[PDB]
Amino acid sequence: MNDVRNDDPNFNVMGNFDHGLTLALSKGRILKETLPLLATAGINLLEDPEKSRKLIFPTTHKQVRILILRASDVPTYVENGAADLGVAGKDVLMEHGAQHVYELLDLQIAKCKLMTAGKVGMERPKGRLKIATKYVNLTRQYYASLGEQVDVIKLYGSMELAPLVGLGDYIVDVVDTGNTLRANGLEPLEEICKVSSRLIVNKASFKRKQVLLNPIISQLEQAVQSR
Amino acid sequence: MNDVRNDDPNFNVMGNFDHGLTLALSKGRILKETLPLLATAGINLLEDPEKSRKLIFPTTHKQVRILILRASDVPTYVENGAADLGVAGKDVLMEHGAQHVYELLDLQIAKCKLMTAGKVGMERPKGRLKIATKYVNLTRQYYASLGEQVDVIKLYGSMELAPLVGLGDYIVDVVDTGNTLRANGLEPLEEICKVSSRLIVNKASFKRKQVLLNPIISQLEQAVQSR
């Protein structure tokens, strides 16, 4: 039983294999809409990670370190217990189909729609369709829902490029406003599901470290104006 | 017509499905090392791609246009002849596959080694080894050599971060020199192979576009004087 939790000294503490808490966060617009909410719970960074060479950022909590991961890695880290909890699009989480995990909260930030997409004035091709996409299992299940089997093409980069150079017949990506799409002579077509960032917790992490977690979770819920 | 194909106008001189020549370049360090070889082949970009909105770039050549891709994707676009030819890490080509592609040149650039690595002063753990890596196939193929089997964990992110937060027993990554590694309290261990950046051509494009291809290839061959 020690007391002090507050931590001003940054570039300090951090440590390895924290048996305190270890928070994995996606690194895109998600990050920026996320840290506001963590603010509410007395968990804040002490520098600009944009401008740090640091790999494990310490926080205002002596008991919480932070990782900025590639958004595909977050469920990998929490699945395995490298992270006790983190934040990711339901898109990633559904595709990853992570095992040893609890989704505890729709943060209702970074909201958008997993959609099929096509070239402006597209023509339906002939035979088995090719689909350029980052989310394989999700399109494979969405076309399995319409009975059609398709040819898939995995990409890790910008999916907007694929149609303009003629990689796919169609693509599957997240559409927020889908303004970017129009600007590149492309169209939103259909809707596969609606999508927001979620808070996930390793199950065993949750069994033991409840003492630390409960306060944090409660505060995040309230920050969403959880009615 | 500014010169014959000398295209100074940037922001234009770029139509779609170029049935001229589409070139696929990997994103970061590789690029900076690829560009000067292209300069000595008559081919330069006309703006900083880092600070550019464009998804397709015109070049000094009007029959040549560049894509700047995630490295994982270069072989994928060229396999599909969305791109005629491409500049991809041999690490990536070996993990991916070589299908509808000729590997024409070892460009002798972005030279490094695919290695195992760990925390400094670690005991071989007891069970199946947990190997965190982007290069799953290469990690599996390699430990099969040694008569071992491993639980592989696919990462898309910083592979340096994994074994500090206790995610991998070891990692497999490409290693230039190992500075960045030892700095973060890791050490390179077993060299799986040497890696360098390679030119590849979609097989069809090679038959069909031999008039554009022939001189370019020849000037790239000459820019290399590794004898």
Listed residue (A84, A69, A169) closest to A119, CA to CA = A169
| Interchain pair B166, A82: CB under 8 A | yes
| Interchain pair B76, A155: CB under 8 A | yes
Judged by DSSP in three states, A20 sits in coil
The minimum CA-CA distance between B211 and chain A, rounded to whole Å, is: 21
Q: Does B147 touch chain A (CB under 8 A)?
A: no
User: What residues of chain B lie within 8 A of the CB of A21, using their CB?
Assistant: none
Residue type, A39: A
Compute the distance between CA of residue B29 and CA of residue B155 in angstroms, rounded to an integer: 20
Q: Extract the tokens encoding A121.
A: 């004035």
Neighbours of A56 (CB within 10 A): 18
Residue type, B152: V
| Interchain pair A157, B83: CB under 8 A | no
User: What residues of chain A lie within 8 A of the CB of B73, using their CB?
Assistant: 155-157
User: What CA–CA distances, in Å, run from A141 to A114, A147, B100?
Assistant: 13, 9, 28
Judged by DSSP in three states, A23 sits in strand
Q: Extract the tokens encoding A124.
A: 């339906």
Contact A197, A109 (CB under 8 A): yes
Listed residue (B97, B98, B65) closest to B83, CA to CA = B65
Bridge-based pairing of strands B85-89 and B22-26 is parallel
Contact A176, A117 (CB under 8 A): no
The secondary structure of residue A67, as a DSSP letter, is E
Compute the distance between CA of residue B17 and CA of residue B83 in angstroms, rounded to an integer: 9
Listed residue (A170, A226, A171, A193) closest to A112, CA to CA = A193
Q: What is the CATH number of the domain that holds A132?
A: 3.40.190.10
User: What residues of chain B lie within 8 A of the CB of A16, using their CB?
Assistant: 164-166
Listed residue (B128, B129, B149) closest to B140, CA to CA = B149
Contact A140, A192 (CB under 8 A): no
User: What residues of chain A lie within 8 A of the CB of B164, using their CB?
Assistant: 16, 55-56
Compute the distance between CA of residue B63 and CA of residue A97 in angstroms, rounded to an integer: 45
What residue has token string 């993990």? B95
Q: Extract the tokens encoding A215.
A: 């306060």
The secondary structure of residue B221, as a DSSP letter, is H
- Beta-ladder partners of B118: B187
Q: Does A72 touch chain B (CB under 8 A)?
A: yes
Contact A104, A201 (CB under 8 A): yes
Q: How many CB pairs under 8 A join A and B?
A: 77
- Beta-ladder partners of A6: A61
Contact A85, A201 (CB under 8 A): yes
Report angle CA B190, B169, A22 to the nearest 5 degrees.
Answer: 135
| Interchain pair A70, B157: CB under 8 A | yes
Contact A184, A164 (CB under 8 A): yes
Compute the distance between CA of residue A125 and CA of residue A168 in angstroms, rounded to an integer: 11
Report angle CA B86, B160, A9 to the nearest 5 degrees.
Answer: 130
Compute the distance between CA of residue B85 and CA of residue B107 in angstroms, rounded to an integer: 14
Q: Extract the tokens encoding B212.
A: 């554009």
Q: Extract the tokens encoding A192.
A: 């596969």
Compute the distance between CA of residue A37 and CA of residue A223 in angstroms, rounded to an integer: 6
Contact A208, A201 (CB under 8 A): no
Listed residue (B132, B109, B135) closest to B26, CA to CA = B109
Of B72, B156, B164, the CB nearest to A56: B164
The tally of CA atoms less than 13 A away on the side-chain side of residue A86 is 35
Bridge-based pairing of strands B170-175 and B112-119 is antiparallel
Contact A188, A181 (CB under 8 A): yes
- Beta-ladder partners of B152: B131
Give one DSSP letter per residue of A103-171, joined into a string.
EEEE---S-EEEEEEEETT----SSSPEEEES-HHHHHHHHHHTT---EEEE-SS-SSHHHHHT--SEE
**Closest Cα in chain B to A185:** B16
B11 Cα distance to chain centroid: 26
The secondary structure of residue B167, as a DSSP letter, is -
Final resolution, Å: 3.2
Residue A87 host element (H or E) = strand A85-89
Which among A74, A165, A171, A184 is the top mutation candidate for probing chain B, defined by the most B β-carbons within 10 Å of its own β-carbon?
A165
Determination technique for this PDB entry?
X-ray
| Interchain pair A55, B166: CB under 8 A | no
Contact B186, A43 (CB under 8 A): no
**What are the DSSP E strand ranges found in chain B?**
22-26, 57-58, 65-69, 85-89, 101-106, 112-119, 129-133, 150-154, 170-175, 186-195, 197-202
Q: What are phi and psi of B117, to 5 degrees?
A: -165, 155
Compute the distance between CA of residue A176 and CA of residue A25 in angstroms, rounded to an integer: 20
Compute the distance between CA of residue A96 and CA of residue B118 in angstroms, rounded to an integer: 26
Compute the distance between CA of residue A123 and CA of residue A102 in angstroms, rounded to an integer: 43
Listed residue (B136, B70, B150) closest to B97, CA to CA = B136
- Beta-ladder partners of B170: B131
B84 Cα distance to chain centroid: 16
B125 Cα distance to chain centroid: 33
User: What residues of chain B lie within 8 A of the CB of A73, using their CB?
Assistant: 155-157
User: What residues of chain B lie within 8 A of the CB of A76, using their CB?
Assistant: 153-155, 167
- Per the structure, the complete domain to which residue B160 belongs is given by 112-194
Listed residue (A74, A61, A70) closest to A18, CA to CA = A61
Q: Does B72 touch chain A (CB under 8 A)?
A: yes
Give one DSSP letter per residue of A50-105, joined into a string.
GG---SSEE-SBTT-EEEE--SSSHHHHHHHTSSSEEEEEHHHHHHHT-SSEEEEE
Q: Does B165 touch chain A (CB under 8 A)?
A: yes
User: What residues of chain A lie within 8 A of the CB of B81, using their CB?
Assistant: none
Of B22, B83, B156, the CB nearest to A73: B156
Contact A88, A77 (CB under 8 A): no
Q: Does A165 touch chain B (CB under 8 A)?
A: yes
